[PDB]
């Protein structure tokens, strides 16, 4: 279930890092880098909670 | 080629035409081991897998 959660769009514009990253510049890729990390975290703490 | 856990694990040559294998490398969490400090201050090092 993490596994498969990783590769999620959490409301962003893709799911890859490396492509958001090359696709504009960085002051328009941190609003998709912090959405991306804001879901992960939620993720990671939900997993270890159970 | 994708596994299980939808991750890529094989990829095949577009210059040759080959299968070719993928795997991550160099995974581990530092350990240091040390017989408290009181009477020594020589530690042992131990990596994870
Ligand atoms: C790729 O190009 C090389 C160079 O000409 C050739 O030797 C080889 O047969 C080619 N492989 C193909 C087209 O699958
Ligand atoms: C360290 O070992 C010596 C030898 O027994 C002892 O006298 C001393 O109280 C010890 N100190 C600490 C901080 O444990």
Do not use: H, M
Request: a negative charge.
């Amino acid at each position: 279930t993490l596994v498969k959660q990783l590769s999620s769009n959490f409301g962003a514009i893709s799911s890859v890092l490396n492509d958001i990253l090359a696709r504009l510049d960085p002051p328009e890729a941190e609003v998709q880098i912090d959405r991306l990390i804001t879901g992960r975290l939620q993720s990671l703490q939900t997993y270890v909670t159970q | 080629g994708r596994d299980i856990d939808d991750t890529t694990d094989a990829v095949r040559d577009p210059q040759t035409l080959e299968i070719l294998d993928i795997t991550p490398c160099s995974f581990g969490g530092v350990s240091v081991i040390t017989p408290g400090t009181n009477t020594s201050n020589q530690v042992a090092v131990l990596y994870q897998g």
